[PDB]
Amino acid sequence: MLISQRPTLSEETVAENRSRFVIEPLEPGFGYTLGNSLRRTLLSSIPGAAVTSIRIDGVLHEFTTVPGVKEDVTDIILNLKGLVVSSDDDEPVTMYLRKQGPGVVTAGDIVPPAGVTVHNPDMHIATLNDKGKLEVELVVERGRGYVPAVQNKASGAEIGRIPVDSIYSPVLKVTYKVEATRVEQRTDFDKLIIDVETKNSISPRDALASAGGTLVELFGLA
Amino acid sequence: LISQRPTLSEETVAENRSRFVIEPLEPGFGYTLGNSLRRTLLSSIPGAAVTSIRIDGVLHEFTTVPGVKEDVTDIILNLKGLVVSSDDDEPVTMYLRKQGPGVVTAGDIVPPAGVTVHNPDMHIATLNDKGKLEVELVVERGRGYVPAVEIGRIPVDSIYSPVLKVTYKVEATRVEQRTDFDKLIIDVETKNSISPRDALASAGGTLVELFGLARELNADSEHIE
Amino acid sequence: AYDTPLGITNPPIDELLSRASSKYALVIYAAKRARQINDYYNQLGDGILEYVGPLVEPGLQEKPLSIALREIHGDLLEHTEG
Amino acid sequence: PFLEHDDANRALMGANMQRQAVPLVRSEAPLVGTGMELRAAIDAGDVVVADKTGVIEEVSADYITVMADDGTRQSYRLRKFARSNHGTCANQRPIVDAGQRVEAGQVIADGPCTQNGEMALGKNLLVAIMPWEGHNYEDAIILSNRLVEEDVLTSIHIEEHEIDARDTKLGAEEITRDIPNVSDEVLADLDERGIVRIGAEVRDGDILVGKVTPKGETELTPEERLLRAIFGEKAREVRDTSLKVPHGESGKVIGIRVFSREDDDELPAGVNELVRVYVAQKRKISDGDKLAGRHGNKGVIGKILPVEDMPFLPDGTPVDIILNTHGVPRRMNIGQILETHLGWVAKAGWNIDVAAGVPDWASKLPEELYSAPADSTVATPVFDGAQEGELAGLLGSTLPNRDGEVMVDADGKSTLFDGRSGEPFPYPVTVGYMYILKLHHLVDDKIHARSTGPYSMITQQPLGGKAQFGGQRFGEMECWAMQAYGAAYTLQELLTIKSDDTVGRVKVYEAIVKGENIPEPGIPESFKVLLKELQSLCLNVEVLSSDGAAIEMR
Amino acid sequence: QCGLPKLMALELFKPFVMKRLVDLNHAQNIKSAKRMVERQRPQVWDVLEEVIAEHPVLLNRAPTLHRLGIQAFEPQLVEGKAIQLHPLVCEAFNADFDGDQMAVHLPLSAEAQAEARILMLSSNNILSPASGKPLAMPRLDMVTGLYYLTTLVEGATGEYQAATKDAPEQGVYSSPAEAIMAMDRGALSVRAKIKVRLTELRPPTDLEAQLFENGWKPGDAWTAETTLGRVMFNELLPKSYPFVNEQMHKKVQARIINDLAERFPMIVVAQTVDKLKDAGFYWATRSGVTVSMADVLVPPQKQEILERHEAEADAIERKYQRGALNHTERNESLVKIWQDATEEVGKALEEFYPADNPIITIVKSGATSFREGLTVLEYFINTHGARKGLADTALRTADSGYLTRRLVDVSQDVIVREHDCETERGINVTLAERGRDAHVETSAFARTLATDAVDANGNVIIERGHDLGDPAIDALLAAGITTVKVRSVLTCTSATGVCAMCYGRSMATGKLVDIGEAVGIVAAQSIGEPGTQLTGGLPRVQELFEARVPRNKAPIADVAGRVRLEESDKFFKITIVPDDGGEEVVYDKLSKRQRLRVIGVLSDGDHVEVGDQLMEGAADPHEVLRVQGPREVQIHLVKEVQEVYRAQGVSIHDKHIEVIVRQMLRRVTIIDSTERAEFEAAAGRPVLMGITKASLATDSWLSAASFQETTRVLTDAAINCRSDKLNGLKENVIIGKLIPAGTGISRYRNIQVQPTEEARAAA
Ligand SMILES: [Zn+2]
């Protein structure tokens, strides 16, 4: 009773950052196991696209303020954590941000070097007034997952740089659901649907493709 | 991206029982692919088994079979253990009919061309005095385990997959700087139709092929080494 | 059976207690032998003494106390209580 | 919240633990609270209040100025990363903008544990009340790695170190950069005076301030003098006395305060220079730390799973913390369950969907809570708060997420998917949002280890050095347990070579490094002191041998 | 095993790793190795797991009550700064996970490591050295997990159905693996009533005998009807253990763990408890146990019905006032209403809560009303009493530690010195009374018989000097023998300490006590530890062990005969008419507030024996001494002492108390020219004295000086010019000598280790 019809993976679209994926059909009790097997891979090993360390010329460490700025340095660091960047990179490339006078500093004000791009220029970083001047460069690296601060005592960064927690995870939220139809009514089979969402750094298809390549390369038979 | 070279080791527990270990996996890939492996081995390996059988003399009789010590229920449980590889794909009807007091041990069943029994020493039943027993049994290939669904026709639970029992566990090894690296332990007991090693290759091959559907969306993404 | 012991739990205390009187005698039993083995790996025993063992095939980096336990498990040595 | 439901024991416990919380970097206000938050915060004095109605003229991280209609001009300097009495960072945040028109008594800047004027001693987390594979056992807790990645439970902690240069018996202390025996790398992060430069990262043992004091007649060892001439390093005149970071500590240097004598200043007689270094630490919520709610419930962090393998709702929304069912029957701890459900209500809003009147349970309710948007804050004063009937009603009304699916039923439960197996949990699990706190008990402060270290003067027992390395006490009761096992050697080892044996502990360390057998223990110094105390009392005691008559230690 | 933070294990083994990374050409000299560890260069970690391997460490949590409060573990380097403790040892350490801290000690010498691996190993210490019951037994989640795993649910999904007219039995499965495959699909429920065949499991003892008798199935097949859970459960137990087929409660698991602890080495028990932990936890999660409003809330009928019965108590008072009081009619009636409502609410709540309600499930398995809310005044009253429990709990811990110290102070020198003293002396045990006793487990279990157990029919069952295991108790109960004479430390004639046989089975090992065991201290701890659960409590206990005259004295029969009960308003008078018949014994002074002793009650004309107690209360131990003699005093003190703890549900084996009591009657008063041994080589009478006075009378003066009031002991010792032979273990502790117990005994520390000439040839 080997009802044989290879599984089929067809794309979909719900928004621009996220799009559904449906795979049908395959053996019962396979949906949940295969769905979470990709989810655990998406939420982890999708490469980024993240900022390592930054340097504010006016400050020497993280626990001080900038004349005229409204947010303290430690609070600007927490605002910069919301940066969703993407870079071909392959090496530490530094970005730059210079703002002056009254206004609001956002991610758009950040000048990305050749090969990198900021995917959320509308994000708020800091609010400057008349006496507010903010010059800050940001080192962007490429990795995956979450890496804690790259303390400049393990590396050779000197007193200027201030390491920052990096988060290389283009994927935002992921779920799935199964709808095995006619469980033994005539012939039994299940079909799963995945809801993948990204941070705009990459598309759901590319992420799922990156996860697929990760699992495919992983299942080794020898 | 490049990993840390996880390896695949196998320790043979018995002739048809072996445990495998993968070391080391990145936190926490142990559980990710783990449950998917047990699910693939159990319900994704092709194999032939018995679907339904009919025994002469029992059409409305439910409990007993005259001239045989084993009751109806106990007789079925024996046949369920019958391991036979049939490449015919479609339902083939084998016949087993022995007379006189004796022990019917599968080797008595004449398999049609295309099906091969692998446990000829299997005890199917014991024969009473001057008693004959003609048994007809349907055998069609399948996958996994399909439960049971004409007068005197008895559908039986079908154990399609060669894999009989599979379980997995995870631990932590590889100290270095981070001591939370995953080690995947998987325990598989196989019937003599195929070895535990081959079962893993089939399960692994079907998984990679199945996950090739997400890869084809773009083979340029980074994934891992 | 008792499956298999991991590290410290091997060998079992029950199979070791048959080799000596009480759990306490077992302690001194293996303790002094461990002192003997470690002397052997060094220069032993200074003047007028020569270290013996390991009697059993030592593990990769097995600890001398762990060796004296396996030796007692195999009856490879006898002791006399005072 | 829901004080009328918890037992006095847990309520007392809850109150005590509320004042044990630590200020978080973000400081989120409680989603389900009472009424005192606003009043308690502004009255504490740790929040900036506007004395006179008017408008803001300037808003900067340093200060805030208000141009009152009266014409007066008031300004407020903000505490920025000010160390509290127990190392807790107190940082004030401005909550107003330039053109804002503020009334008298209003809140201008948030304190350490305040948000928008009301106390914020903790964070609102997604909770699931199911036992999870033994990792949340008894009172243990499991957290999502999100709490580390998103710095939700991260709190800054500042430490103060101090050193002094005074006149001594044979010389005057001098705090200078040059250290006797050191490499140029260890002094690489020191300034020209010898104090650690601002913004420098300091590991355990690194030098903060280089102080040097006069040493008497050298009378050095010949084996050392020979190497002196060989390598041409002149045996310096005085000894080394540098201030290093305590063992197990680390962080960045915030500020340095230097009080000199040439600069007149005012120091105790003999003191020439006085400098203090302030070191700060950004503490991620780590496994082992102690969390607790407002109802007395407390427990350590037993594990922190990656967000991937975590019971998650159908949305894919992982839960933040998994709490086992601590409350055994009769023990109850009912108040906790109530705020958990209300937490989900306040997070998702509600709408009674009034049709042909309002349900009988809402009759006692005042209009205002009928409709509420998502993420709304609620206040249920202690004795006069929400009631059981009104709760279940709010449970019925729950605005779906994106796509309109529902995540929680009228029972406050949801079918969670095990993030590891991928399969759902067979039964619906209670989920919600509970306001938990981070308590002062921290792993970094409570972990101690010691191989060798300083020893007291009077009693030669291992003394907890002011840097660290304090030894553990093997009390009288532990000795009883050791005697119970019959482990005579382990007991003797603890009370001798591991403590009072002057020549024993050194020969043991020596024997360990060489790999030799551990020598036989000697006489514990405590006993020798005992005999001396007796003799001083005119008690002639003699340690008689079996055939050696009298003996003395010496 | 135990989880050890890498940083903690590093600094702890710093000298060790220093040598290893110098042996390996990583660092060239010691100084180079020190900085390599201090700066935590990543090259040391690999070296650390080697030095740590098979190197045991000791874990301890204050306060230390019993010896199990310190155990050895295998150190595993774990990420983080916390210590990972095994969930089964929590019971022993009494370790909450609400911020509790534990200490780590690194045994160094070869002897120390040997003592940790052998004596103090975690897996070797499973049974409580006080009651013999298991402590590593699963608890809390593990119980509910296994309770849910093995529970049988009628009408389950894959429930078995008998073969109908046109279909066979549908609940049968080929093997347990099939049921697993059926479970994965929506076919089989873990808690169904299916019947399956088993090949590698053991059938019940009674059922198999029918199916076999030729021999228990090693690979033989057999079918029984169970639940897949119960099948998966028995797979955890040893392959040699017969099937159980029951929904597992704490007691069942307690009953099972005990049973299998007697018949298997602890390694088998250690692994079996570990497997139960995994299953219990695993199924505890799938158990669906969660709390919510609908789980707690309120039975609305309760609040309504409570106001109903409250009206009956108010109007009854109205009827009481007029003239319908009828004296005691009210008190009884009000009680009937209050208990009728109290009993009616239990049903209104128990029947209203589902059988599988999460709160009820936790209660049934054995792992373990503000719902409406209280107004302002209601909460104030509740605080008045709640604060008394916290303050009263502060006094429970102080005195229990002050009692445990005196207990240890008097019994520490008691150790086993020889295998057998060969004395016929023994003490009788009541052993059952049904015609099984309630307290046979504390006084009869783990004893040795001084005389054979003879049945009236002439068949001898259980020979003298037997271990008296629970199977022996049943075998004894089979023949219906009421009493049994048993060896005891009260009767041991050992010149020094006690002997193994008289003491009996070690509660921890389950076998005969080892010669070196220091039982006195174990006894003190076994008694002091439960002192925290005393409410007829801690003061009563100290009254007994200190030998003080009872708070409210009670008289004992000075002779045998009849009794004349006389009633006088001033006092009760009890006259005893002896059966001699000689001079009558008068007990004139008696307070009516002391009541009478119970048999009915002691009435006029009843018979009284030589040691009977006449009135309720506590008999003067010094009184019963001169009447019944020393041996009967010790039986009395153990009787009263055990009755206190038993009142609190504390299981202490009598031998522990006996060890303490033995030390009270060890001396005699010299009326004309102290210990007993001096008299054998001038009349003296047996003396009873408290533990504090007895301890101060020890032969060691610096031992007694350390106990209480050092001045008097020092002054009296200096004048007498006493000399301490360093005989006890406290002395050796102070001076740093090897205590004369355990590995300190001469016979154990003088062992010679020489390899057999045959082994040296193999090389
Ligand atoms: Zn005896």
From Swiss-Prot, chain B:
It catalyses: RNA(n) + a ribonucleoside 5'-triphosphate = RNA(n+1) + diphosphate. The chain holds residues 2 to 233 of 350 of the full protein. It comes from Mycolicibacterium smegmatis (strain ATCC 700084 / mc(2)155). GO terms for cellular component: cytoplasm; DNA-directed RNA polymerase complex. GO terms for molecular function: DNA binding; DNA-directed RNA polymerase activity; protein dimerization activity. Keywords: DNA-directed RNA polymerase, Nucleotidyltransferase, Transcription, Transferase. The keyword rRNA-binding does not apply. Homodimer. The RNAP catalytic core consists of 2 alpha, 1 beta, 1 beta' and 1 omega subunit. When a sigma factor is associated with the core the holoenzyme is formed, which can initiate transcription. Its EC number is 2.7.7.6. Belongs to the RNA polymerase alpha chain family. The lineage of its organism: Bacteria, Bacillati, Actinomycetota, Actinomycetes, Mycobacteriales. The N-terminal domain is essential for RNAP assembly and basal transcription, whereas the C-terminal domain is involved in interaction with transcriptional regulators and with upstream promoter elements. DNA-dependent RNA polymerase catalyzes the transcription of DNA into RNA using the four ribonucleoside triphosphates as substrates. Residues 1-218 are annotated as: Alpha N-terminal domain (alpha-NTD). GO terms for biological process: DNA-templated transcription. This is DNA-directed RNA polymerase subunit alpha. The keyword Protein biosynthesis does not apply. The gene is rpoA.
Swiss-Prot record, chain C:
It comes from the Bacteria. GO terms for cellular component: DNA-directed RNA polymerase complex. It catalyses: RNA(n) + a ribonucleoside 5'-triphosphate = RNA(n+1) + diphosphate. Its EC number is 2.7.7.6. Keywords: DNA-directed RNA polymerase, Nucleotidyltransferase, Transcription, Transferase. GO terms for molecular function: DNA binding; DNA-directed RNA polymerase activity. GO terms for biological process: DNA-templated transcription. Belongs to the RNA polymerase subunit omega family. Promotes RNA polymerase assembly. Latches the N- and C-terminal regions of the beta' subunit thereby facilitating its interaction with the beta and alpha subunits. The RNAP catalytic core consists of 2 alpha, 1 beta, 1 beta' and 1 omega subunit. When a sigma factor is associated with the core the holoenzyme is formed, which can initiate transcription. This is DNA-directed RNA polymerase subunit omega. The lineage of its organism: Bacteria, Bacillati, Actinomycetota, Actinomycetes, Mycobacteriales. The chain holds residues 25 to 106 of 107 of the full protein.
From Swiss-Prot, chain D:
GO terms for molecular function: DNA binding; DNA-directed RNA polymerase activity; ribonucleoside binding. Keywords: Antibiotic resistance, DNA-directed RNA polymerase, Nucleotidyltransferase, Transcription, Transferase. GO terms for biological process: DNA-templated transcription; response to antibiotic. Coiled coil: none annotated. One of its GO terms (cellular component) is DNA-directed RNA polymerase complex. DNA-dependent RNA polymerase catalyzes the transcription of DNA into RNA using the four ribonucleoside triphosphates as substrates. This subunit often mutates to generate rifampicin (Rif) resistance. Interaction with RbpA partially restores Rif-inhibited transcription; once the subunit is Rif-resistant however RbpA no longer stimulates transcription. Mutations in the RRDR sequence (residues 423-449) confer rifampicin (Rif) resistance. Rif blocks transcription initiation but not elongation. The RNAP catalytic core consists of 2 alpha, 1 beta, 1 beta' and 1 omega subunit. When a sigma factor is associated with the core the holoenzyme is formed, which can initiate transcription. Interacts with RbpA, which partially restores Rif-inhibited transcription. Belongs to the RNA polymerase beta chain family. This is DNA-directed RNA polymerase subunit beta. It comes from Mycolicibacterium smegmatis (strain ATCC 700084 / mc(2)155). The lineage of its organism: Bacteria, Bacillati, Actinomycetota, Actinomycetes, Mycobacteriales.
Swiss-Prot record, chain E:
Zn(2+) 2 binds at residues 421, 492, 499, 502. GO terms for molecular function: DNA binding; DNA-directed RNA polymerase activity; magnesium ion binding; zinc ion binding. Mg(2+) binds at residues 96, 98, 100. Its EC number is 2.7.7.6. It catalyses: RNA(n) + a ribonucleoside 5'-triphosphate = RNA(n+1) + diphosphate. DNA-dependent RNA polymerase catalyzes the transcription of DNA into RNA using the four ribonucleoside triphosphates as substrates. This is DNA-directed RNA polymerase subunit beta'. It comes from Mycolicibacterium smegmatis (strain ATCC 700084 / mc(2)155). The gene is rpoC. The chain holds residues 440 to 1283 of 1317 of the full protein.
